[PDB]
């Protein structure tokens, strides 16, 4: 006969949710990675031979956990910064000496019983006329919904990488397969104590400074045939994109309240021009040709078309940025405008606008005010992914349109955490054999 | 010969307090059920045999911990959203054209600080105090900052299951007619307490548990007149309360965001707040309650008086049903005598009060927003907080008044059957055994 | 030959840093003594026989946590108190009717947030600065919001006990005349430090620990000229201070339940606060300190100077007793010179201050409420913080000056007899032992 026996420290795991903590190489950052445990310079990415694992990035709890942590870190970093509640006053504006508005208003100086007049330049997107009757009085946007909070000028929004590591007794399974579509039995799997440096870069309609595919365009989607589901595309090579803010801004500081400083834009040195981004037309042309070819595999012999968003709020209908403090809003209609078929000076300029009063989380409770950055600022990054949506309300016929989707910041990080999944190891295992305990 | 031997996993415990925590059934509730850990769908209640335990719900420390959690949860629900300190501006009021209401008007700042605005509102007389001569001040703005009760959350007393950390246990007494103290001979153990609704009522226990077969009286010292005498009914007494005033709701923005809500015009005839209770059902209850008191002590006439009097936060029955706090005058109930021998509801006038504290805390105050339209409410009266008046030596009759004046005793009527103990799974005893080398 | 053998419960340790937790001996104190865990019934110190190891008070992280912990407690005791943000209104000052006091008048909003109130108050010139010259402004108003400490909680240096979690222990050096960094004898271990009083002060340690049998001079580097030199006294040099101004406090409510206290009026003639010290005792005590100072380095030319100069917070002697904060001109003490050869009270003029930045924080400003009536106090001077500026060739002479420019070194003089270590009871050693199957 056979008897049951137990074995400790056995290799086996199960899918389960667990808390994750910060980890990063190494004060003045919004993510507060300096008050975090340092990362291990020897990642034990141990390869697991012959194991098969089922991964579903659309169901892991890490993406949702990261979303809450990023929001928590953002709110926490603003708690000690000065509040801009007093700015909600009548704003008398005039045209700049079209996109800017030279405004004058009374401000509460350090002495609470004294008010001082201040001249400032506010973008038209951050100003909304209080009385339509006269375009002279204006009220700051988001003033009738939440209190304005100014970002601390010392801290910066640089997306420094952060490694998400689980406590002891849990492991992160990494999928090494070249071309994991994001859901399936990853053939090439390895175990690592925790993920690599994840850069929390906030973006919309495009993935910046993200990971790149190995040698084939990866199109991942929980339901490629659905319309309400977002389609994430990953490029094999990076498409360099560079922008610039030609307005040579002159930042001026005036103290309001008991020693609390306020930063605003002063006079512009030289000519004033709209913000814009550049991208090689030749590189982007071949990129869409390859992307459309791969996407065509999910619909057979059909043509692919790209449109310029669906319309609505500026927060979701345009690309975003976190360049040195500023927050750009670029009109991507110059890129998602073309047609493709089965068979098939060099730069594209995207008009952009800058808005300081932002939220970047679709929340109506808190309002972010980005202080202006002095002098000309240039921004360069690599395009590694796109957030697409299948636009269709009729028969698929011979063509199908696609637009840069999104409307959910969770999809931004899903494109980077697709390679991982958290599991709980159960070192207890029972199996039978031909031995009996002595007595 | 007898050698000592240690036993592990011994079933023995000792009385001791611990760090209790919540548990509830599956952001918009003041008790924060979403944040609390979900409760087990099948709590494994184990019955015990031959065991007797000494219960003392008065000396119980978990009741005080629950009092802290309720207050802690209250602050955590008011603190996040809008505060109401800017409303300390002077008020100009006059009588309503259509007694208990005043058409108050005052100057206030709109969304933009540079611009002002003149508004009109209808505040209850209890929420307004004179300052002079038609000038008044908002009550409580000379003692604490007002915090408007955030309307996105509801004050519905959803039950919360109270659990204890692992290694401890809660003893649940199931003996019929078991008062607060005594040796329980039907003890049972359970990981967490059953669904307990934290009602904020005072002077009368609403929506609480009921007795098994007869009325039970609880008091650490019934002879002491300064000790509360909690009474529990066997059959509940339905009570219905309503405010016929339609009370339309309006809103104004005081500074950036902070959408303040205030009462508008009263649609229809104005009327006072009141409650209804069946005379026969309530009168019959006092007959048995008085009989129970007579059987315990003072085998003579028993009488009930209309409280002691004082502030409305102490000498009046209050409840939270309907979203607006009520302050009812229970003088119409405790107005009867009981000797040894022995459509039609009783009306109780009530007054609404928006500026409240509900915890006798003079450092904090909260403003309840108005509820549009008429509000319907019904509840089961399962207990009372009686306080026998002992200012004079009893001769032939005793005077009982619905006193209280303490919020801890309100919930003590529900946790009377619980006691937390720490498990001691290690013990020793003698045995004729010898461990070899 | 021999084989390995692992032991448990081994008495070994390593110099490591750990998180300390307070245990205030047995609500009304800034250090939150009522919140700390109860102190031990008695210090369970175990004497370490035959043990001798190195000590280092200038590198241990325990002193750093003491500074940070005290900082957190100070801020934690200020957050629930009233804030004086609306008090930044301009001030119109004039000379007092009866030189360092100014009769300032300003406007403030009463309890109602609509009406203004004109008041008159007395503010010390140190905390009042001009704007151009009849208009003035409060100091630190252009740096941070002024916060008022609750008048019912005092800043008395109540002792607190520092403790280590299980697995960590603090070694206690008990060598008479122990100077510091180096070998120590008569070591002892205890799970919690003795009652240490966080006596906040500058260039003068009040109510500190007296020397065992002789004057002790300690510093991480005596040869270093630009470093602090701490001295411990074996005898207590009693200091007596008093504020003869009969202050009469008055108050107003700047907001709902937000009372503000200020100096209403002074009865009699204004007299600057001062500190007394017996000339004979200080002269003799300071002479002994000079002798030990000469032993370490140099011969003769033991000269003391009147501070360095600059900000008042560092130049003067910080002192607090009864609620008020004092800043005295210590030039009367450190004014002498000696060689190998070798009424009755020294008075130190003092200027009271109300706006202070304890812990030298620009982001926070404290405002001590004025204490009514005459206030007098006494303390024991047990330690001095001295610095030298002998950068030039000290062949003929050099001098010393008071200061420190840091609060961390203040507690270092008290925690000099402690060191935290980590206990790793897992040890190994060879032995003729063989394991069986």
């Amino acid at each position: 006969n056979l008897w049951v026996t137990v074995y400790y420290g056995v290799p086996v795991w199960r899918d389960a949710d667990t808390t994750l903590f910060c980890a990063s190489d190494a004060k003045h950052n919004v993510w507060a990675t300096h008050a975090c445990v340092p990362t291990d310079p020897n990642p034990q990415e141990i390869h697991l031979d012959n194991v098969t694992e089922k991964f579903n990035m659309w169901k892991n709890n890490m993406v949702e956990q990261m979303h809450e942590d990023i929001i928590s870190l953002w709110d926490q970093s603003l708690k000690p910064c000065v509040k801009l509640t007093p700015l909600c006053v009548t704003l008398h504006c005039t045209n700049v000496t079209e996109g800017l508005k030279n405004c004058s208003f009374n401000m509460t100086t350090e002495l609470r019983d004294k008010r001082q007049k201040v001249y400032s330049l506010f973008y038209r997107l951050d100003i909304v006329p209080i009385n339509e009757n006269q375009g002279s009085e204006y009220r700051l946007i988001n003033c009738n919904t939440s209190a304005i909070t100014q970002a601390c000028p010392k801290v910066s929004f640089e997306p420094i990488p952060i490694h998400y590591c689980t406590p002891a007794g849990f492991a992160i399974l990494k999928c090494k397969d070249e071309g994991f579509n994001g859901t399936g039995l990853c053939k090439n799997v390895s175990t690592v104590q925790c993920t690599h440096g994840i850069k929390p870069v906030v973006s919309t309609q495009l993935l910046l400074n993200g990971s790149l595919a190995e040698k084939n365009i990866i199109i991942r989607s929980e339901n490629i045939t659905n319309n309400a589901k977002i389609i994430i595309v990953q490029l094999v090579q990076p498409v360099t994109i560079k922008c610039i803010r030609p307005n040579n801004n002159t930042v001026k500081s005036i103290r309001i309240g008991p020693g609390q400083a306020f930063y605003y834009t002063g006079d512009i040195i030289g000519d004033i021009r709209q913000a814009h981004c550049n991208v090689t037309r030749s590189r982007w042309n071949k990129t869409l040709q390859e992307v459309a070819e791969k996407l065509r595999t999910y619909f057979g012999n059909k043509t692919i078309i790209f449109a310029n968003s669906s319309g609505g709020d500026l927060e979701i209908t345009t690309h975003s940025f976190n360049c040195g403090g500023e927050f750009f809003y670029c009109n991507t209609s110059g890129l998602f405008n073309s047609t493709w078929y089965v068979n098939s000076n060099d730069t594209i300029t995207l008009p952009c606008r800058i808005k300081q009063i932002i939220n970047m989380w679709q929340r109506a409770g808190q309002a972010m005010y980005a202080p202006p950055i002095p002098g000309v600022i240039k921004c360069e990054s690599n395009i590694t992914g796109l957030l697409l949506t299948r636009d269709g309300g009729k028969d698929n016929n011979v063509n199908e349109t696609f637009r840069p989707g999104g409307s959910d910041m969770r999809d931004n990080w899903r494109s980077e955490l697709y390679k991982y999944k958290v599991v709980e190891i159960e070192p207890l295992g029972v199996a039978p054999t031909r031995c009996k305990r002595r007595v | 010969n007898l050698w000592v031997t240690v036993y592990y996993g011994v079933p023995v415990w000792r009385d001791a307090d611990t760090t209790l925590f919540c548990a509830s059934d599956a952001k918009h509730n003041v008790w924060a059920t979403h944040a609390c850990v979900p409760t087990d769908p099948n709590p494994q209640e184990i019955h015990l045999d031959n065991v007797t335990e000494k219960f003392n719900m008065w000396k119980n420390n978990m009741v005080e911990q629950m009092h802290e959690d309720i207050i802690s949860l209250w602050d955590q629900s008011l603190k996040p959203c809008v505060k109401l300190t800017p409303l300390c501006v002077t008020l100009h009021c006059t009588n309503v054209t259509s007694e208990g209401l005043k058409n108050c008007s005052f100057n206030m700042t709109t969304e933009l600080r540079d611009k002002r605005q003149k508004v009109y509102s209808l505040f209850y007389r209890l929420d307004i105090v004179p300052i002079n001569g038609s000038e008044y001040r908002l009550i409580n703005c000379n003692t604490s900052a007002i915090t408007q009760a955030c309307p996105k959350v509801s004050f519905e007393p959803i039950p919360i299951h109270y659990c204890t950390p692992a290694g401890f246990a809660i003893l649940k007494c199931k003996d019929e007619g078991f008062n607060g103290t005594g040796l329980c001979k039907n003890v049972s153990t359970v990981q967490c307490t059953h669904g307990i609704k934290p009602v904020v009522s005072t002077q009368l226990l609403l929506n609480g548990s009921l007795a098994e077969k007869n009325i039970i009286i609880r008091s650490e010292n019934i002879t002491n007149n300064a000790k509360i005498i909690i009474v529990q009914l066997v059959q509940p007494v339905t009570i219905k309360c309503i405010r016929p005033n339609n009370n339309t709701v309006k809103s104004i923005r005081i500074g950036p965001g902070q959408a303040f809500y205030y009462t508008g015009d009263i649609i229809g005839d104005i009327r006072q707040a009141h409650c209804n209770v069946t005379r026969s059902r309530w009168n019959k209850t006092l007959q048995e309650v008085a009989e129970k008191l007579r059987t315990y002590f003072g085998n003579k006439t028993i009488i009930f008086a209309n409280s002691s009097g004082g502030d409305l936060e102490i000498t009046t029955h209050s409840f939270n049903c309907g979203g607006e706090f009520f302050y009812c005058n229970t003088s119409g109930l405790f107005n009867s005598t009981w000797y040894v021998n022995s459509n039609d509801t009783i009306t109780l006038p009530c007054r609404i009060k928006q500026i409240i504290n509900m915890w006798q805390r003079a450092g904090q105050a909260m403003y309840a927003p108005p509820i549009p339209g008429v509000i319907k409410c019904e509840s089961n009266i399962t207990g009372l907080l009686l306080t026998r008046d002992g200012g004079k030596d009893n001769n032939v009759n005793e005077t009982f008044r619905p006193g209280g004046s303490d919020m801890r005793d309100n919930w003590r009527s529900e946790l009377y059957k619980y006691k937390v103990v720490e498990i001691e799974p290690l013990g020793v005893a003698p045995t004729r055994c010898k461990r070899r080398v | 030959n021999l084989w390995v053998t692992v032991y448990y419960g081994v008495p070994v340790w390593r110099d490591a840093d750990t998180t300390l937790f307070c245990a205030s001996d047995a609500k009304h104190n800034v250090w939150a003594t009522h919140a700390c865990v109860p102190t031990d019934p008695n210090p369970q110190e175990i004497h370490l026989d035959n043990v001798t190891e190195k000590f280092n008070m200038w590198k241990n992280n325990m002193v750093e946590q003491m500074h940070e912990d005290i900082i957190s407690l100070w801020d934690q005791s200020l957050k629930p108190c009233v804030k004086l943000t609306p008090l930044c209104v301009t001030l119109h000052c004039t000379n007092v009717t009866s030189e360092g006091l100014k009769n300032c008048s300003f406007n403030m909003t009463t309890e109602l947030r609509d009406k203004r109130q004109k008041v008159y108050s007395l503010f010390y010139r140190l905390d009042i600065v001009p704007i151009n010259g009849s208009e003035y402004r409060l100091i630190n108003c252009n740096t941070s919001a002024i916060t008022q400490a609750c008048p019912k909680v005092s800043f008395e240096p109540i002792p607190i006990h520092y403790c280590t979690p299980a697995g960590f222990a603090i070694l206690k050096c008990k060598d008479e005349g122990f100077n510091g960094t180096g070998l120590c004898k008569n070591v002892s271990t205890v799970q919690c430090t003795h009652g240490i009083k966080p006596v906040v002060s500058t260039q003068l340690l009040l109510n500190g620990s007296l020397a065992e049998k002789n004057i002790i001079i300690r510093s991480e580097n005596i040869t270093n000229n630009a470093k602090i030199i701490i001295v411990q006294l074996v005898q207590p040099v009693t200091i007596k201070c008093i504020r003869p101004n009969n202050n009469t406090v008055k108050s107003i409510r700047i907001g709902p339940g937000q009372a503000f206290y200020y100096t209403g009026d002074i009865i009699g003639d204004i007299r600057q606060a001062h500190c007394n010290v017996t000339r004979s005792r200080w002269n003799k005590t300071l002479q002994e300190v000079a002798e030990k100072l000469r032993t370490y380095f140099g011969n003769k030319t033991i000269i003391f100077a009147n501070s360095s100069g600059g900000d008042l917070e560092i130049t003067t002697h910080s002192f607090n007793c009864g609620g008020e904060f004092f800043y005295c001109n210590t030039s009367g003490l450190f004014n002498s010179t000696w060689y190998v050869n070798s009424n009755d009270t020294i008075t130190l003029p003092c200027r009271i201050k109300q706006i202070i930045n304890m812990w030298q924080r620009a982001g926070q400003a404290m405002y001590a409420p004025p204490i009514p009536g005459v206030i007098k106090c006494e303390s024991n001077i047990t330690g001095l913080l001295l610095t030298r500026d002998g950068g030039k060739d000290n062949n003929v002479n050099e001098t010393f000056r008071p200061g420190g420019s840091d609060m961390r070194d203040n507690w270092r003089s008290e925690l000099y007899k402690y060191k935290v270590v980590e206990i790793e009871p897992l040890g190994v050693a060879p032995t003729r032992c063989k394991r069986r199957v």
Epitope: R112, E137 | - | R113, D114, R116
Partner: antibody
Framework: QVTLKESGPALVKPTQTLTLTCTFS??????????VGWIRQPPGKALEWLAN???????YYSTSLKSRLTISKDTSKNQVALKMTNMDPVDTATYFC???????????????????????WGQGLRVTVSS | DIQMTQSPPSLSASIGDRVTITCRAS??????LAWYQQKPGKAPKRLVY???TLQGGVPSRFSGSGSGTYFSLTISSLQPEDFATYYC?????????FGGGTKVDIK
């Protein structure tokens, strides 16, 4: 019922100094906010503000008349007087004494002050400049 | 200086006809503006303050509108007692200033 009553010399010689004074009964000018001012209207011309005095004694005058206008209040007898020098022929007009109002607010961040339009006006008196 | 203006300075109306006048400012003066009625050779009287709140006791025939920099007084129906001069005053900040006046003539 509040009422204003102004008085002064009906005729004044040129280049001389004159004083006007108006009485009030409905207010005492000390109820934290009450103000009072003077306005003038030439024959057939538009109105013209002259000066305003508030409860706290604060005075405000017109930009063109700041060099020859003065306003004072006598709260002990409920009176407000205006003094004007350098009488010129164009100054002949009908002078009115009207009560104004002022309000304050304190939203923690900073003090806010608001003015109000005149509500009550006096009967008025005509001043003629003749040689 | 906060200069004020108003148009039409003089107009001709008819009995029972609706008529309105406008007042413009040199800059934004919020809604701190009021209007006054003045009979020929009489003390002025206020009829609307804050540009929207009708003065108590005055009939509902008059009404105010506008804000920021463009204000206006509307009269739904004229009556013979309307023979008077209307003035627009601003009280946003000192110095106070009156409008140019508007005379009405009934045909």
């Amino acid at each position: 019922q509040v009422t204003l009553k102004e008085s002064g010399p009906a005729l004044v010689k040129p280049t001389q100094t004159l004083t006007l004074t108006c009485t009030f009964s409905g207010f005492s000018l000390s109820t934290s906010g009450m103000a009072v001012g003077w306005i003038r209207q030439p024959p057939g011309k538009a109105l013209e503000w002259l000066a305003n005095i508030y409860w706290d004694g604060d005075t405000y005058y017109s930009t063109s008349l700041k060099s020859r206008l003065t306003i004072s209040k006598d709260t002990s007898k409920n009176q407000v007087a205006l003094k004007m020098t350098n009488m010129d022929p164009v100054d002949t007009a009908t002078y009115f004494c009207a009560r104004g109002e002022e309000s304050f607010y304190e939203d923690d961040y900073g003090q806010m002050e608001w003015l109000h339009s005149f509500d009550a006006w006096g009967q008025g008196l005509r001043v003629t400049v003749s040689s | 200086d906060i200069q004020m203006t108003q148009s039409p300075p003089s107009l001709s109306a008819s009995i029972g006809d609706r008529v309105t006048i406008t007042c413009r400012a040199s800059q934004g003066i919020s809604n701190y503006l009021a209007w006054y009625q003045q009979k020929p050779g009489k003390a002025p009287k206020r009829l609307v303050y804050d540009a929207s709140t009708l003065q108590g006791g005055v009939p509902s025939r008059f009404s105010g509108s506008g804000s920021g920099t463009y204000f206006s007084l509307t009269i739904s129906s004229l009556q013979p007692e309307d023979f008077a001069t209307y003035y627009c005053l601003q009280h946003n900040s000192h110095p106070l200033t009156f409008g140019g006046g508007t005379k009405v003539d009934i045909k």
